[PDB]
Amino acid sequence: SDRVSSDTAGNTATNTQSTVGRLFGFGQRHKGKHPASCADTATDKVLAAERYYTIKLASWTKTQESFDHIRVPLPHALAGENGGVFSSTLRRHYLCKCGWRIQVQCNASQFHAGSLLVFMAPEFDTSNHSTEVEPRADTAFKVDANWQKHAQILTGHAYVNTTTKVNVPLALNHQNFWQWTTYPHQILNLRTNTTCDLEVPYVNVCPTSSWTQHANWTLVIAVLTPLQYSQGSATTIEITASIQPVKPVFNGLRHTVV
């Protein structure tokens, strides 16, 4: 009913029929103001970049447990070729400042059970935790390919070998997921909605970001209640997301990164 919602962005448009509204993190929106730390007049209002970029994220199965999650580093998740003009413009600029408008999608049925927590978090560790190796430029800002387990992050994850790990009780990349709900979020309850709509402004340690070195925002999808269904019900349950950079402004035009 009042749950039918359409949202336009450039030459793209998202549509849902089970929305529970859009949550604005910090009750703020990125207004697109130029960073006062740059003298060069920023490149902005690029319609071809102010749109929704949709990508498949993961498959939800009965094996996932509460707090298992998928991470989507930003803006990096869209710095690839599929980032269209947002990407091609980003790659050719030293700095970028922007917010995010996101909708994650996931449908099941009236006979399926389970729920996900969809949230945005600033300075949320996106590094690989299945190794004791130091994170690198090409391994630190990648969209998770597999669901991440939860136990190994409560007290953090030090990039040191297994035997040293014993004398390291806490790492600064710790994430007490029991409170992940304190981050701007929404819940995707299979019985209620098939979409979640969020939007966050630009936050960072500085006016604009040298994105090549920093993924300030992270979109995270974690299961809260495990997926359940009986014999006969659809078994393929997938999660998708439409990500829109809100009024991105670019500074420091230069040759592209490789």
């Binding site: 509460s66 049925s109 009236q110 006979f111 399926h112 059970a113 389970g114 729920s115 409560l154 007290t155 009780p169 806490l170 007490n176 029991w178 409170q179 709900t181 304190t182 819940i187 309850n189 299979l190 019985r191 209620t192 809260l224 209640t225 495990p226 359940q228 269904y229 009986s230 014999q231 006969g232 019900s233």
Partner: protein
């Protein structure tokens, strides 16, 4: 910091293998005992990892409402009714549905809306109550919240017998904490 206390966070329920999960099960039957029992203390091991408890651990006393949020995750074809009861102390824990429904309670009926926001009224002999304790006292333990199966969960064929109800807690609208302190330290693991 109160902002955090009001964000509903997950309670830790025990799995059949004594594992901790954010929900409890219900099926086509009405047990003579409560499905879950939470002692109202910000010290409950049950809410030990909720944001509410995490913040409360750094304060000496609280006052005000507590919100226990239950989210039904069963199928859309599953129906049923629960009786959520809050029993103040003095006569011990309620042993039967007859006793539970004699205290503060609300009947939760499943349907279009998925969750039920239950409030444990602040009923206390004192204006403030302790966040933790060595031994339970009348100023640190305030009774129990038990959820019973009023009518059995009912459903058609082709539907799994067990439904999972997510459980969360947080401070209510008039909830407050006071006196900043350091909680008993522990070794992470």
């Amino acid at each position: 910091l109160l902002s955090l206390c009001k964000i509903p966070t997950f309670l830790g329920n025990l799995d059949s293998n004594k594992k901790r999960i954010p929900y409890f099960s219900a099926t086509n039957s009405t047990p003579a005992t409560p499905l879950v029992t939470y002692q109202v203390t910000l010290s409950c091991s049950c809410m030990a990892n909720s944001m509410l408890a995490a913040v409360a651990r750094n304060f000496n006393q609280y006052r005000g409402s507590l919100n226990y949020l239950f989210v039904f995750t069963g199928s859309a074809m599953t129906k049923g009714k629960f009786l959520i009861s809050y029993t103040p102390p003095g006569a011990g824990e309620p042993k039967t549905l007859d006793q539970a429904m004699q205290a503060t309670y609300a009947i939760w009926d499943l349907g279009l809306n998925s969750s039920y926001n239950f409030t444990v009224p602040f009923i206390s002999p004192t204006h403030y109550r302790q966040t933790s304790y060595n031994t339970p006292t009348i100023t640190s333990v305030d009774g129990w919240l038990t959820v019973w199966q009023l009518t059995p969960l009912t459903y058609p064929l082709g539907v799994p017998n067990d439904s999972h109800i997510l459980t969360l807690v947080s401070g209510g609208d008039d909830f407050t904490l006071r006196m900043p302190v350091t909680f008993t330290k522990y070794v992470p693991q």
